[PDB]
Each structure stands twice: as structure tokens, then as C-alpha cells.
């Protein structure tokens, strides 16, 4: 194929795409997304990677905020990040491990920016709301049984009294 495309990049396969919606989740009193917030986000991602590599693979890897490479920053606050080895640029942590790391510590990242799983979407990491507990058997059935029992008793006693009177 003669020619080239201006969209393929060697890092484009392992990139996780973040989309942040500040103004919706916070309404007013929402901060601006300057470079300090990007620094905090990269530090949070590096912390998540450290936690994942310590608590799962039992390896102590010294990730840093400069190891979370960020590209395609856009005004929507939508970009692509990927994490390399601590000092080995040619080594890219494969996307599966990054996704597992983010799933493991997504709560802390959400709390750092006061976002909840809807304004901070990782586009590939779908959260779980949690199973809805069911009561022991059925409250409606218990109430219906009580009501039907009392109504049946009333009918029986009324019929018996009416028959006995006559």
C-alpha cells in the first residue's frame, strides 16, 4: 500500500483512553484542568501501577509520574496514556496489566478528583455497580398471606354467626 496514514503510532496499541467530564459531575465549583491536574493524574496512575505490582505480582517497581506518557490532550479532557518500565523506555507495560491495575485502584483515582465512574471513563474498563440484594423470600407474599388469612377468618365467622342466628 503506497502512502501512509497520520493516525497510526507505535504506542497506539497499548494506549488507554481517558475521558474526563468535570462540569457535569461537579456543576459549579469545578476546577480547571491545568498542567497541575495532569501531574496529579499521572502520579495517581503511577501509584495505581505500584500498588498492582506490589499486591499481585509481589515485585517492587518504582514507577514515577514521568513514566505515564500522555498524548493527544484535547479540550474535552480526553487523552491517551500508557505506562513504560521504570527506566527502560523500550519496555511498555502491556495494556492488560494496566487495565487490571486501574480496576484494582479505580476508587482512589476517582476520589482524588472527586469524580464517580461516569465523569472519569477509561474506555475499556467498565465498572460494576454491585449485585442487588434480595430479601429472604418475598415481603409482598407475606403481606398477602396475612391479609387473605384475616379476610378468610372474617368471612368464616360471619357465615357461622349468620347461620347460627337463623
Amino acid at each position: 500500500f503506497v502512502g501512509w496514514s497520520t493516525d497510526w503510532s507505535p504506542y497506539a496499541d497499548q494506549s488507554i483512553k481517558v475521558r474526563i467530564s468535570l462540569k457535569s459531575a461537579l456543576g459549579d465549583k469545578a476546577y480547571e484542568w491545568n498542567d497541575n491536574e495532569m501531574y496529579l493524574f499521572r502520579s495517581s496512575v503511577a501509584y495505581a501501577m505500584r500498588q498492582y505490582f506490589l499486591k499481585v505480582k509481589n515485585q517492587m517497581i518504582l514507577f514515577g509520574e514521568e513514566d505515564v506518557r500522555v498524548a493527544n490532550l484535547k479540550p474535552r479532557i480526553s487523552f491517551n496514556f500508557f505506562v513504560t518500565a521504570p527506566k527502560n523506555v523500550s519496555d511498555i507495560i502491556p495494556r492488560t496489566e494496566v487495565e487490571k491495575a486501574i480496576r484494582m485502584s479505580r476508587s482512589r483515582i476517582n476520589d482524588a478528583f472527586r469524580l464517580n465512574d461516569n465523569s472519569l471513563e477509561f474506555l475499556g474498563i467498565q465498572p460494576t455497580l454491585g449485585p442487588p440484594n434480595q430479601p429472604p423470600v418475598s415481603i409482598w407474599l407475606i403481606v398477602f398471606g396475612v391479609v387473605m388469612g384475616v379476610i378468610v377468618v372474617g368471612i368464616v365467622i360471619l357465615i357461622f354467626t349468620g347461620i347460627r342466628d337463623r
Partner: protein, 572 residues
């Protein structure tokens, strides 16, 4: 006077005012239905209700006794007026059953109609529960489990069957227990519905977009005002809410003194019925307008989110006040990208949502469950509302079943063989056993058929026959003289005018228009739930559903001429 007036009010004010009127108004255009209603109340409601009360007094007999004493060739109209009641009592109780269901699912912190169930990934919501509302999903799937079409029906759903059995047991217990102890009840059962409706109006008028609902309710769209079906439904709802044609109003007026003012009482009863219907429908349509506004806002937010996630716009840049301009700007920026999703961008407006937000016989339940889910202590308000509804239904059914049973008890042939407690038990058992067809998977369609044809047009023909009998066969001069001698005051000229010519002519014109419309259309259709589309679609009635539709009206209406033919044969 208070006893008779409150008895008539408690009979008339029931589920036809709080439940049937709102969805009938919604179905036929809102204001386009309200203008005929009032128009059909001055002409059809008041004069014929007054005529019924006067025949009840001047005969001072039962319905069959009165229409047999006027002339033997006419006794059949006393029998038919019972049969209609039968069909009413056959399906009316289903409504009460539903309320019981909605009551029993009201003691749970996660109210069933409040939160949709999880899809199965445990990451989202059900497809049909998201396309529809949680209340609509609960009503159409958790409550009825409605089948997609009338031709498809399953077995008897055991939960609705048990609820209907409980409702019939409650009705039988109320029949056995009390017959004249309504003293304090009339003080209580007449104010509790108004208190609950006042509370729900207080909530209903502070919701976002309540005025949209009121504007839809009170706007008389001329375009859909020409539909004859709207006029037919208005007249039949007036007759069904006042109880005209059921024959129990005649029995109620039979126990009144002949030196009483039935012109004041008829006017007061009709006006109170109209006011109660209007108030309940106002509250219901305020909540309905809130629902429509919420749906419109949700669609606009979804479209804005779709555009923002694609064009990489700012979080709050795209709002509802600058949508079209930014859409034009985006279209002008580059059409290649816009071409891909242009089918996907959806058009939504308040009007279309207002026509098609919620519609059907479950309008009251869906709307009021939504309102409850937007309360603070939802359980208490749900219990209170579905208890007011239970009281209204139980009172109306007590009236209807008394109308059913009085001819049976008065017959010495049956009364000399079985006790009244057994006659009533057998009647309740037969009604409950036959009404199990409304608890099937496709039972809501049969309920639709009975709600629209069992006691709809027969009440018109019965009242037409009654008024022709009173005016022309008995002789209006003789009737007026008898009434004047009974009460000292001669009937007003307005009442005579409405009795003799205006009401029968309007009824005949309505019947002719309905028949002409049905013939020209040639395709009777019904609404069916579509879970995949999550809305209501129109489907043609099958061949076997028209036989039942025809028979329901035909038996009750034709019971009069058959009796006339039998009397003629007996004479010859």
C-alpha cells in the same frame, strides 16, 4: 337528604373518576376530549340522571318492576340493565386486584418500580427497562407480564389470580358484614380520596414541567376534535361514571320520599362527579407533564452527549439552548464526519413525548408510582394512595354487586331454596372464576375489550330506550302531572325539552357517527406492548376477538327486543 345524596355520591365516585377518566382524556387528545365531556354533561348527564331519579320516585319500585309497570312489552329493559352490571362486575374487580398488588409491593425500601434490574453483566440496566421507564417496566412485565400480541397467550398467572381472589373475598366479606352501618363511613370514605388527591396535587404542582401537562390537558386541539370516537367515549364515560343504565339509581331513588327535590339532588350529584373527575385528572396530568418534560430533557442530554463524545467539544459547551446552531456549525465545519452519525442523531420535542409518554389502561398506576418514587417517604404515600383507590373500588363494587343481587334475592323461586349468603357466595364465585381470563399473559387485551365494549354502548341504548319509554309510551304530560302532584312543583320546561328531544337525538347521532366511522375505517385496532421498541404499537383485532366484542354488546342490547317478541308471542 344527606343520606340519599351521600349514597348516590359514594356510588358514582369510584374508579371511573380517578382511573378511567385520566387515560381516556390522554388517549383522545387532552383538551380535545375535555370539551365534549362538559358538552356531553349538560345535555346527557344531568337530564337523564334527573329522569332516572324521577322514575325511581314516581314508580317507587325496582328497575324491572318500574319498566314492567310502565308496559309489559318493555320488561326486558329491566333484565338487560342487570346483565350489563354483571359484565361490569366481571372485570371491574381486576382493577382492585391490581391495586392490591401495588399495595403489597409497597413495604420495600428498594421499591420495585424505582430501580431497574441489572442487565446481567452487573454493569448496566435491562434493555427493556431502560428503553421504557422503571414504572412502565414494572407495570407491563412484573405486574401483567403482557404478551406481545393477543394471539399469543400463556397460562393463568398465579400472582394476579391470587390478587383477584383476594379482592373477591374482600368484596364478599363486605357484602356479608354491613348493609346500613355506612353512617361514619360516609363521613370518612368521602373525604379521604379528596385529602389524598390534595396531597398529590401539592406534590404534583411543584414538579419540573407541570405546566406542560396542564397545557396539554387544557388545550382543545381542533384537528383531533373532529374524531367521533372522542365524543362516543365522552358520552359513554359520563354514563359509566354516573351509573346511568345500571338500574341501581332507580332502586336508590325508590326509597326516597315523593316530597323531595330531585332537581337539586341530580344537579349536585352530577356536578360533584364532574368536579372529582376533573380534579383527579388535573393531578394525574400534572404528573404526566412532569414525565414528558423529563423524557424530553433526557433525550436532549443524550443527543448533546453523543455530539460531545464525537466532536471532542467541551464538557458544558453544548447545552439545550445552543444545540441547532452548534449542529449547523458542526455540519458546516466538516460534513464527512457528520454524515456518519446523522441517522443516529434523534429528533425529540415536547409535543410528541406528550402524546406518547404514557398511554393505556395503566396510566394511573404508572403515573402515580412515578410520583411516589419522587417522594420523601415513598412507602407511606404509596400505601395511602393505593388504599384510597382500594376504598373507591370496593365501594363502587359494593354498589354494583347490590344492583346485581337485589333482583336475585327478590325472586322467591331462588330465595325459597338457598340462603342469601349462599346466593351471594355463588355469584361471587362465578364472577371470580370467569374473571380469571384477565389474569393470563394476554389478559390485559381482554381487559381492554371489556373496558371498551362490555358496558360502553349498551348503556347508551338502555338509556335511549328508557327515555323514549318515559316520554312517548307513558306520556310526558301524564308523567309531568304525576311528578307535580308528588312534589307540588311542575317539571321545568328545560328538563322537558332535554328529556323529549335533545338527549335521544344526540344519542342517535352519536351512534350513527360511530357506526359510519367504523364502517369507513373497516379495521378495528388495539394497542399492544412492544418491549423491543419499549412502547405501544397498533395491531388489528383477530377474527375471534371480534366475535366476543360483538357478543358483549349484542346480548345486553338485544335482551330488550327478544323480551318484546316473547311478550307478543305470549299474547298471541
Amino acid at each position: 337528604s344527606l343520606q340519599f345524596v351521600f349514597a348516590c355520591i359514594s356510588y358514582a365516585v369510584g374508579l371511573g373518576n380517578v382511573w378511567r377518566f385520566p387515560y381516556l382524556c390522554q388517549m383522545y387528545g387532552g383538551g380535545s376530549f375535555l370539551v365534549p365531556y362538559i358538552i356531553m354533561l349538560i345535555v346527557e348527564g344531568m337530564p337523564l340522571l334527573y329522569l332516572e331519579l324521577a322514575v325511581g320516585q314516581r314508580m317507587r319500585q325496582g328497575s324491572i318492576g318500574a319498566w314492567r309497570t310502565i308496559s309489559p312489552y318493555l320488561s326486558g329493559v329491566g333484565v338487560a340493565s342487570v346483565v350489563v352490571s354483571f359484565f361490569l362486575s366481571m372485570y371491574y374487580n381486576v382493577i382492585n386486584a391490581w391495586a392490591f398488588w401495588y399495595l403489597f409491593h409497597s413495604f420495600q425500601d428498594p421499591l420495585p418500580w424505582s430501580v431497574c434490574p441489572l442487565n446481567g453483566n452487573h454493569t448496566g440496566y435491562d434493555e427493556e427497562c431502560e428503553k421504557a421507564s422503571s414504572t412502565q417496566y414494572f407495570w407491563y412485565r412484573k405486574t401483567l407480564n403482557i404478551s406481545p400480541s393477543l394471539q399469543e397467550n400463556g397460562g393463568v398467572q398465579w400472582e394476579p389470580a391470587l390478587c383477584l381472589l383476594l379482592a373477591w373475598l374482600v368484596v364478599y366479606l363486605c357484602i356479608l358484614r354491613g348493609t346500613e352501618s355506612t353512617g361514619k363511613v360516609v363521613y370518612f370514605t368521602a373525604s379521604l380520596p379528596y385529602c389524598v388527591l390534595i396531597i398529590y396535587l401539592i406534590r404534583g404542582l411543584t414538579l419540573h414541567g407541570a405546566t406542560n401537562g396542564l397545557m396539554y390537558m387544557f388545550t382543545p386541539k381542533i384537528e383531533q376534535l373532529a374524531n367521533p370516537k372522542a365524543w362516543i367515549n365522552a358520552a359513554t364515560q359520563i354514563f359509566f361514571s354516573l351509573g346511568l343504565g345500571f338500574g341501581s339509581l332507580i332502586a336508590f331513588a325508590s326509597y326516597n320520599e315523593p316530597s323531595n327535590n330531585c332537581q337539586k339532588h341530580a344537579i349536585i350529584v352530577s356536578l360533584i362527579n364532574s368536579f372529582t373527575s376533573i380534579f383527579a385528572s388535573i393531578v394525574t396530568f400534572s404528573i404526566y407533564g412532569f414525565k414528558a418534560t423529563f423524557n424530553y430533557e433526557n433525550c436532549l442530554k443524550k443527543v448533546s452527549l453523543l455530539l460531545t463524545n464525537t466532536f471532542d467539544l467541551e464538557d458544558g459547551f453544548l447545552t439545550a439552548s445552543n444545540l441547532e446552531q452548534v449542529k449547523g456549525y458542526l455540519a458546516s465545519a466538516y460534513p464527512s464526519k457528520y454524515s456518519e452519525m446523522f441517522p443516529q442523531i434523534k429528533n425529540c420535542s415536547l409535543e410528541s413525548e406528550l402524546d406518547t409518554a404514557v398511554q393505556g389502561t395503566g396510566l394511573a398506576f404508572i403515573v402515580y408510582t412515578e410520583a411516589i418514587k419522587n417522594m420523601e417517604v415513598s412507602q407511606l404515600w404509596s400505601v395511602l394512595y393505593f388504599f384510597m383507590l382500594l376504598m373507591l373500588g370496593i365501594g363502587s363494587m359494593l354498589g354494583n354487586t347490590a344492583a346485581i343481587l337485589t333482583p336475585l334475592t327478590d325472586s322467591k323461586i331462588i330465595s325459597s331454596h338457598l340462603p342469601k349468603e349462599a346466593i351471594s357466595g355463588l355469584v361471587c364465585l362465578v364472577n371470580c372464576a370467569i374473571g380469571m381470563v384477565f389474569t393470563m399473559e394476554a389478559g390485559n387485551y381482554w381487559f381492554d375489550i371489556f373496558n371498551d365494549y362490555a358496558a360502553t354502548l349498551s348503556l347508551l341504548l338502555i338509556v335511549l330506550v328508557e327515555t323514549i319509554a318515559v316520554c312517548y309510551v307513558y306520556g310526558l304530560r301524564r308523567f309531568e302531572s304525576d311528578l307535580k302532584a308528588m312534589t307540588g312543583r311542575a317539571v321545568s320546561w328545560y328538563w322537558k325539552v332535554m328529556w323529549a328531544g335533545v338527549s335521544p337525538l344526540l344519542i342517535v347521532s352519536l351512534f350513527v357517527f360511530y357506526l359510519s366511522d367504523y364502517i369507513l375505517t373497516g379495521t378495528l385496532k388495539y394497542q399492544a406492548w412492544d418491549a423491543s421498541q419499549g412502547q405501544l404499537v397498533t395491531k388489528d383485532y383477530p377474527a375471534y376477538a371480534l366475535a366476543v366484542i360483538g357478543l358483549l354488546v349484542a346480548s345486553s342490547t338485544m335482551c330488550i327486543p327478544l323480551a318484546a317478541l316473547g311478550t307478543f308471542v305470549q299474547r298471541r
